[PDB]
Amino acid sequence: AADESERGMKVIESRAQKDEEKMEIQEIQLKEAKHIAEDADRKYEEVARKLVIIES
Amino acid sequence: AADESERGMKVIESRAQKDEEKMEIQEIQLKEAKHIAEDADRKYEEVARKLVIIES
Amino acid sequence: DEDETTALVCDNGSGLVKAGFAGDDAPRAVFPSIVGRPRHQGVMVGMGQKDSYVGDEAQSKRGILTLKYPIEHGIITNWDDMEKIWHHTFYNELRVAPEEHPTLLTEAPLNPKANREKMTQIMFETFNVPAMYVAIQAVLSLYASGRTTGIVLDSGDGVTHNVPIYEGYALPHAIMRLDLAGRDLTDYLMKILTERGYSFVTTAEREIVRDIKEKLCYVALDFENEMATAASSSSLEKSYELPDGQVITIGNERFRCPETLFQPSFIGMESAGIHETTYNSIMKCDIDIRKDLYANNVMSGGTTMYPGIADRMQKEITALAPSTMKIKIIAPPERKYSVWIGGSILASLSTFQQMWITKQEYDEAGPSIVHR
Amino acid sequence: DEDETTALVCDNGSGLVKAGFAGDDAPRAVFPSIVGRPRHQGVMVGMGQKDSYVGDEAQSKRGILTLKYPIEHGIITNWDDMEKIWHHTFYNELRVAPEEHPTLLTEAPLNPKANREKMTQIMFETFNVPAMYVAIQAVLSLYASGRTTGIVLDSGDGVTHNVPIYEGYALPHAIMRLDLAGRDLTDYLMKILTERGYSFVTTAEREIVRDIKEKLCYVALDFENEMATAASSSSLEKSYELPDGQVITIGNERFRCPETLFQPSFIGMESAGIHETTYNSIMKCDIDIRKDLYANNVMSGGTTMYPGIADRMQKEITALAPSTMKIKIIAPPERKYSVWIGGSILASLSTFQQMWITKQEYDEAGPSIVHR
Amino acid sequence: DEDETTALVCDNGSGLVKAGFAGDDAPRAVFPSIVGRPRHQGVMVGMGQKDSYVGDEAQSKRGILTLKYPIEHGIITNWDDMEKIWHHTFYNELRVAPEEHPTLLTEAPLNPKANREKMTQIMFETFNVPAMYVAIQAVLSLYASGRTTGIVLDSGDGVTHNVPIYEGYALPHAIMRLDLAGRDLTDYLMKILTERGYSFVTTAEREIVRDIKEKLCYVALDFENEMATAASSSSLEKSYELPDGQVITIGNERFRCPETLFQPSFIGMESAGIHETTYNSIMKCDIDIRKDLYANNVMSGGTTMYPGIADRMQKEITALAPSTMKIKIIAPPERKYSVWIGGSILASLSTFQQMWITKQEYDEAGPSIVHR
């Protein structure tokens, strides 16, 4: 019973590492994607306000 | 040795589930964040082109 | 409606006042926190002799007046001149009569007990407001970001603060104050820009260095290999056109200015910087609450608006915090009004009615009543 | 079913309450035996003013409350605060109304006559339970291991005991109490771990030393040449990852902590240790019953769960007992709930119905009735 | 004379080193326990490039160096920087060559075995002293007050301790350490004095708050009706003249600072205070020795010098101790050097010669020899 439970432990610990790495790479790609979404959505409100003032 | 390795198995399987869920919720939040970043990056390339013509 | 419409929210700052009605999404009134006193006798065409000037008329006419700032570093230092800014806010800016409006005011982090009692004395006894309430600024900022536990890095015009808050109670012994903010930051840009070979000679040159700081300044992450980048000279440069043609270029200094917030040594300050201070606040708090504070670094204040401030802070504290920890730097877009918006929410709220200090409480308990 | 379903079993401890329904295999409710009283006036968001807190809400909110333990060393010391823990158990934890449930309670080994009468007074007169019963703890532990004669080494959070039982009657004059248990043991680990060059500084560092003790601590047999082993430095070491990354390593101290149970001298205790005390209990009993007690050393309690406790005890008493004797140390896996399980069995039993003290017995005989 | 003259006594502290010759009545050398490392390359006029600075030259030149404290809370934390402070002590401060002087050193209460062996390794192997000896600090303080059994409340710059000693052996399991001392106390005064409406802005303002604490601070007995007294405003106030004219007044806060030692809650500390801790040490000791400890509360350390500390402690423990007991709080005048003086006495003593660890003992037994 012990040897079968050690083997299963090893396999689920390896899957847990393999997925924990995937989360961290997405979680980081996203602080990036959200930050470029926000740097983009500021530049505009300055350019669109700049548009409405130079149209006025 | 068997009871400690069963307990550790249970705890790492529980962490593996808990993190697999976190990845899926970030991975989905991101198709959303990237898509809003792109719906954003088209309309101020349009509004800034509209700006440069009404500034000219 | 009696007071649903009627609650006022006045956030008193070192540089700006933010004011308006509880309910609104943003301040109806924003203006400098100055009180000008004319250096000479005379008049403007069509007006009478004016003893005093406040806000923008004091800024615009600064050449003939002696300008004074009532709030030094977030604390009210001159009460004669503050009652003047309040008067202006109610009567001219919001054009309301105060004696029928409940007023939510804000104070600073370790505001002396005696001050909270004094502005209550002036609110009730010289403005005769029905009821009032003083909220702590970081606490309204947090709450406006939905939560109740977190640590706010708050940074405006004269002060920076770190106020760790747990289930609403700001933690007195863990609060840190750093007297370097947006005011200090405009004057440093000034010098690195004259030092770029320029001259901000007339007052129309002075004022706009501040508009350069706001529009073009950045907080780069890896400020190290950003200077290095500056040198290879990429299309990193940025030219601004002055009141006239005089196109001034700012490439590099653009980020050397907010690197002052992480390195106070850029300005002859020996104090620690923003990120270390976030952290030190945190290793001054209870142990069990430190995972909470780390996942809830809420930013508020005009000077925390520099783009990429959050990414630099993100990486600044990850790399100081134990790896077992989750770091999370929340920086909302409306952050230059977080404080105010948190007050608008709170004061328009359904449950806040029972915390308003009324003239009944006051006339019966003395200023002590609101002091808590 | 009337009461087959309906019997409650509440085991009151120095650290934990274990509670649930007779019939179940394990306690439905397990929680700290604290009652917190707020040090300041104020509220949590959305709740009202609370006068008191019990169990985990008292632990979680410990920074604003004064925590108090009603049971000192297994004996109820504060009856106002105990009625509070019972109230919480029935109404919030098990969510039952007590006035229709028979309640089996437990008491400690030489529990003063007057207490057994007082908790009966409170069970029947303030909770109005239909019927109740007080079992002695070691006696339920024994019985849950099937037998009726044996000696229980019982060790939990504030007390250790040896209760020799013969055909069900616990032997008053042979019972030994040693006031060093799991609570004492967590605080000693604490010091040998700070002494390993560490700091359990915030409250999130304090609490988890106890989770280190539970997960990684061992009772080595031949604790002598285990220290010797430590030195050659084998892969005996064990690193635990803290709330954050901060991987702490514990090699050796891992077993220096339960060696405290055999050597009280590790902690400035002059009393004898667990194994000697097992033995002394035994040479205080009748002669003809000593072979029985020796082949039936039943262990129960959270602190007897340290792996290899049984092997060390096995060899500890073989080598003190006359060689003509059979030694036998029974340590079941569910032992942190033996006491409770013994109560669940007994109270769900077919023959126990005729020992329940009913309100009829009480209203007619006074607290004396159940006291026996 | 060989060594009658020749024995050195070095007391290593968290804030100060006290040093001199066994025989003298007071330390020949007292100086900060810092090691400064220059932040920039350059020189003073007439000197060469200096890699390091120690004691007062590190304090005086602090603006261009990074200051570091080798002893954190009484324990040596950096051994590179400590060997630097020792070097300075022998060669510059006492101007002796160490290789012909026996050296009595002191260590802290539960100083890790390994440290006592390490400073022995450095004393004998890098300084080549003839012989040395490490005394425990509370133990030298007691002995300098004539006696051998008592309990010392020892309080300096980074730690407070209670060390119950019986016929010379300090009792390991009854010792209590409270990490709040004179350093913590100067920083709290700082805030209650800026909070009185002041500014300790330049470094010449910072340093002198500590000289205010030493000269004007008090420990009032009945700290309750001393605040009450403050309010009626008696001639309790006290103005100090700064480096310049700037006469600062301190009335009240004067005693609010040492009330921190009885109430750690003044500074966000949740630990118990000095008097309770004296007591708890005492109800952790053997029963038969508790009358002795109570009649012999010896005080030592810079922070126990606040006038009226002894009267407050006198009444603090009388009212916690059983009335059958005799309380007695000994606080001598030289107490800021008790530790040192106890070493001077002991090491100049006629009978101590046979406990000196000699290089013969060391070269033959390893660091283990002195470790005891």
Residues 6+ apart with CB under 8 A from D185: D213, D257, D258, D260, D261, D303
Cβ contact, residue pair B26, A26, below 8 Å: yes
Residues 6+ apart with CB under 8 A from E192: E253, E256, E257
Q: Which residues of C touch A46 (CB under 8 A)?
A: 215
Nearest 5°: CA angle at E300, between E295 and E301? 155
- Rounded to the nearest angstrom, the minimum Cα separation between C321 and chain D is 9
CB of D183 closer than 8 Å to CB of D266 = no
Q: In 10 A of CB A1, how many CB atoms?
A: 8
* E46–chain C Cβ distance below 8 A for any pair: no
Rounded (10°) CA dihedral C222, C228, C229, C234: 160
Nearest 5°: CA angle at C74, between C73 and C75? 95
Cβ contact, residue pair C307, A31, below 8 Å: no
CA distance E275 to E268: 18
* D268–chain E Cβ distance below 8 A for any pair: yes
Cβ contact, residue pair D195, E112, below 8 Å: yes
For E264, the closest chain C residue by CA position comes to C173
For A30, the closest chain C residue by CA position comes to C311
Where helices occur in chain C by DSSP H, the ranges are 56-60, 79-88, 113-122, 137-144, 182-194, 203-216, 224-232, 253-256, 259-262, 274-282, 290-294, 309-318, 338-348, 359-365, 368-371
Cβ contact, residue pair B26, A27, below 8 Å: yes
Residues 6+ apart with CB under 8 A from C168: C139, C143, C148, D45
DSSP codes, C97-165:
-GGGS-EEEEE-TT--HHHHHHHHHHIIIII--SEEEEEEHHHHHHHHTT-SSEEEEEE-SS-EEEEEE
* Strand E150-155 to C357-358 pairing: unpaired
* C174–chain E Cβ distance below 8 A for any pair: yes
CA distance C304 to C310: 8
Q: Which two tokens mark D241?
A: 């990852």
Report how far apart the first and last C-alpha atoms of chain E are (Å, whole number). Answer: 27
Rounded (10°) CA dihedral C280, C284, C286, C287: 50
Residue E51, Cβ density class (10 Å: 0-12 exposed, 13-18 middle, ≥19 buried) = exposed
* Strand E247-250 to E297-300 pairing: unpaired
Q: Which residues of D touch C169 (CB under 8 A)?
A: 42
CA distances from E245 to E48, E99, E199, E202 (A): 38, 50, 15, 15
Solved using = cryo-EM
CB of C323 closer than 8 Å to CB of C335 = no
Helix (H, G, I), strand (E, B) or coil at C240: strand
Report how far apart the first and last C-alpha atoms of chain C are (Å, whole number). Answer: 27
CB of D40 closer than 8 Å to CB of D50 = no
DSSP codes, D153-190:
EEE-SS-EEEEEEETTEE-GGG-EEE---HHHHHHHHH
CA distance D234 to E233: 70
CA distance D168 to D171: 9
Q: Which residues of C touch A31 (CB under 8 A)?
A: 311, 314
Q: In 10 A of CB D265, how many CB atoms?
A: 12
Cβ contact, residue pair E173, D63, below 8 Å: no
In Å, the largest CA–CA distance within chain E is 71
Chains C and B touch, contact meaning at least 3 pairs of CB atoms under 8 angstroms apart: no
CB of C105 closer than 8 Å to CB of C10 = yes
CB of D83 closer than 8 Å to CB of D52 = no
Cβ contact, residue pair E173, D268, below 8 Å: yes
For C173, the closest chain E residue by CA position comes to E268
| Probe site for chain C from A24, A29, A35 (most C CB atoms < 10 A) | A35
Q: Which residues of B touch A51 (CB under 8 A)?
A: 47-48, 50-51, 54
Spatial CA neighbour of D267 closest among D161, D155, D160, D191: D191
Q: Which residues of C touch D203 (CB under 8 A)?
A: 286-289
- Rounded to the nearest angstrom, the minimum Cα separation between E286 and chain D is 10
For A39, the closest chain C residue by CA position comes to C307
Q: Which two tokens mark C345?
A: 């929410």
Provide the CA D152 distance to its chain's centre, in angstroms.
12
CA distance D246 to E120: 32
CA distances from A34 to A46, C39, C308, E300 (A): 19, 52, 12, 60
Nearest 5°: CA angle at E26, between E23 and E29? 105
Helix (H, G, I), strand (E, B) or coil at C255: helix
**Gap sites in chain A (C to N > 2.5 Å), preceding residue numbers:** none
* C314–chain A Cβ distance below 8 A for any pair: yes
CA distance E141 to E337: 8
Rounded (10°) CA dihedral D60, D63, D66, D71: 40
Q: Which chains lie within 8 Å of chain D at 3 or more CB pairs, if any? A: C, E
Spatial CA neighbour of C14 closest among C139, C111, C125, C144: C111
CA distance E203 to E62: 10
Tokens 């030393």 sit on residue: D209
Q: Kindly provide the b/e burial profile for residues E309-333, where b requires at least 16 CB atoms within 10 angstroms of the residue's own CB.
A: bbebbbebbeebbeeeeebebbbbe
Spatial CA neighbour of D299 closest among D312, D287, D289: D312
Which secondary structure element, helix H or strand E, spans residue A33, and what is its range?
Answer: helix A2-55
Provide the CA E291 distance to its chain's centre, in angstroms.
27
| Probe site for chain B from A26, A31, A35, A55 (most B CB atoms < 10 A) | A26
CA distance C212 to C239: 10
CB of D339 closer than 8 Å to CB of D106 = yes
CB of C18 closer than 8 Å to CB of C340 = yes
In Å, the largest CA–CA distance within chain B is 80
Helix (H, G, I), strand (E, B) or coil at D12: strand
Provide the CA C273 distance to its chain's centre, in angstroms.
18
Q: Kindly provide the b/e burial profile for residues E181-208, where b requires at least 16 CB atoms within 10 angstroms of the residue's own CB.
A: bbbbbbebbbebbeeeebebeeeebeeb
CA distance C103 to C120: 11
* D48–chain C Cβ distance below 8 A for any pair: no
Resolution (A): 35.0
Nearest 5°: CA angle at C280, between C275 and C284? 150
Helix (H, G, I), strand (E, B) or coil at D136: strand
CA distance C305 to C302: 6
* E2–chain C Cβ distance below 8 A for any pair: no
Q: Which chains lie within 8 Å of chain B at 3 or more CB pairs, if any? A: A
Q: Which residues of A touch B8 (CB under 8 A)?
A: 9
CB of E310 closer than 8 Å to CB of E335 = no
Q: Which of C285, C286, C323 is opposite residue D244, by nearest beta carbon?
A: C323
* B11–chain A Cβ distance below 8 A for any pair: no
Q: Which two tokens mark D110?
A: 């030489």
Q: Which chains lie within 8 Å of chain A at 3 or more CB pairs, if any? A: B, C
* Strand C29-32 to D103-107 pairing: unpaired
- 3-state SS of chain E: helix, strand, coil percent to 5? 40, 20, 40
DSSP codes, E138-196:
HHHHHHHTT-SSEEEEEE-SS-EEEEEEETTEE-TTT-EEE---HHHHHHHHHHHHHTT
CA distance E347 to E3: 10
- R_g over Cα of chain D: 22
Where helices occur in chain D by DSSP H, the ranges are 56-60, 79-88, 113-122, 137-144, 182-194, 203-216, 224-232, 253-256, 259-262, 274-282, 290-294, 309-318, 338-348, 359-365, 368-371
Cβ contact, residue pair C172, E268, below 8 Å: yes
Where helices occur in C51-112 by DSSP H, the ranges are 56-60, 79-88
Tokens 């609490």 sit on residue: D207
Helix (H, G, I), strand (E, B) or coil at D125: helix
Conformational region of residue E301, where left means phi above 0, alpha means psi within -120 to 50, and beta covers everything else: left
